[PDB]
Amino acid sequence: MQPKLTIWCSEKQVDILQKLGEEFKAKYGVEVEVQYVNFQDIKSKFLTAAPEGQGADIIVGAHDWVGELAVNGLIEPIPNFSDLKNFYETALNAFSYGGKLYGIPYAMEAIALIYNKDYVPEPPKTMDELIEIAKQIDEEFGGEVRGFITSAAEFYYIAPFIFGYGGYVFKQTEKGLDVNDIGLANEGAIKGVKLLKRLVDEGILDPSDNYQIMDSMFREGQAAMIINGPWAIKAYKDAGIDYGVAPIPDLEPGVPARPFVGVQGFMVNAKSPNKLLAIEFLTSFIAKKETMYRIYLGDPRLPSRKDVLELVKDNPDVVGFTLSAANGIPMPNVPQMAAVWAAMNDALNLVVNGKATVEEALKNAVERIKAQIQS
């Protein structure tokens, strides 16, 4: 009886993984099934389905998930394999927790300014310049082209402002992250969210702006500038957008934006009876140079396998996202990160909708995060 491996991944990886799965099946007789799952639903679906025996054998996603999934016993440690040396240790360590490796990373990433050269031939260097250019576009195009869009109420996309001014999630200490020292309502976080509020107040961002609006308007030629990541670029290129990638404009003189840095990788379901075969598929096939490069070609981010990064290092998009990531802060992978996102999203929703001051919204967010961490 032929065995089967099921993979959950976002829309970005479906095509390339489908093709690789067909190749693995032709060679070995192992059925491979690639199932699209909305990215923000992968982890929550896996938390629900994995204990019920209904989780995918392999999930694809971000390294911040690792600590929560590892301590809950839901993802399987990956034993050493011959290709392990070929991956950057920073990428492997992002997928490591409690001394063990829990995923095969394929790329790192960070959001950046993505701009349509038809409207913005040369990218702004400061946020003050970006604000002026966006206002000009909003006026000159009578509302048919948005000057600037990002996901206004989503913490992941506002983090570059929060961190640029000195906010932080958990305090970085010489003994690791201090989950009892949260910096998402310090004066830097407040100044960064006050910049978000300025963008809304000056009409550059609309209270309803979200990921789908940003992504779709940019892909359809209706947005001059966005803040988004390298996962979005292939769709823009196929749609015919003449885009560029640049670091997010400095928040003010001498204060660069500092985005989250994320690592994307393949994790194995520890509850799956196929976990040994899933590991074999990842280490013997997915981890290889050609396969990792084919994944890049299908889903272009910043490759984690060193010899693949060398192939792409001169691509202007790779150069642009690397410049943005150079100022960035890696997302924590500790289990306590699960308590962070929803509280911060809720606080930013209140701010962009004029429902609370920045200081009150962030203060309440941190009390919510702390209470959840403490149990």
Ligand X SMILES: OC[C@H]1O[C@H](O[C@H]2[C@H](O)[C@@H](O)[C@@H](O[C@H]3[C@H](O)[C@@H](O)[C@@H](O[C@H]4[C@H](O)[C@@H](O)[C@@H](O)O[C@@H]4CO)O[C@@H]3CO)O[C@@H]2CO)[C@H](O)[C@@H](O)[C@@H]1O
In the list 84, 177, 217, 342, the residue contacting ligand X (rule: CB under 6 A) is 342
| DSSP string over 151-198 | -TT-HHHHHHHHHHTT-EEEEEETTEEEEEEEETTSHHHHHHHHHHHH
How far apart are CB 135 and ligand X at their closest, in Å? Answer: 26
Choice between 40 and 54, CB closer to ligand X: 40
Choice between 21 and 300, CB closer to ligand X: 300
Q: Computed over its alpha carbons, how large is the radius of gyration of the chain?
A: 21
- Residue 222 near residue 144, CB atoms below 8 Å: yes
How far apart are CB 131 and ligand X at their closest, in Å? Answer: 24
Alpha-helical segments (H) within 252-315: 275-281, 289-298, 306-312
Residues 127-166 that bind ligand X (CB under 6 A): 154, 156
In the list 36, 81, 88, 211, the residue contacting ligand X (rule: CB under 6 A) is 211
Please tell me the total number of residues recorded for the chain in this structure.
375
Joined tokens for residue 340: 């962070």
Comparing CA positions, the residue from 187, 211, 173, 168 lying closest to residue 337 is 168
Joined tokens for residue 296: 């890049």
Residues 229-248 that bind ligand X (CB under 6 A): 229, 231
Q: Give how many residues touch ligand X by CB under 6 A.
A: 18
Choice between 41 and 201, CB closer to ligand X: 41
* CB neighbour class for 140 (10 Å; exposed up to 12, middle 13-18, buried from 19): exposed
Phi, psi values for residue 144, rounded to 5°: -80, -15
Choice between 87 and 156, CB closer to ligand X: 156
- Residue 216 near residue 293, CB atoms below 8 Å: no
Choice between 61 and 247, CB closer to ligand X: 61
Q: What span, in angstroms and rounded, lies between the C-alpha atoms of 129 and 283?
A: 47
Joined tokens for residue 342: 């929803």
Residues 37-66 that bind ligand X (CB under 6 A): 39-40, 43-44, 62, 64-65
How far apart are CB 1 and ligand X at their closest, in Å? Answer: 33
Residues 249-308 that bind ligand X (CB under 6 A): 262
Residues 91-110 that bind ligand X (CB under 6 A): 109
**In angstroms, how far is CA 360 from the centroid of its own chain?**
27
How far apart are CB 44 and ligand X at their closest, in Å? Answer: 4
How far apart are CB 262 and ligand X at their closest, in Å? Answer: 4
Q: For binding to ligand X (CB under 6 A), which residues are involved?
A: 10, 12, 39-40, 43-44, 62, 64-65, 109, 154, 156, 211, 229, 231, 262, 341-342
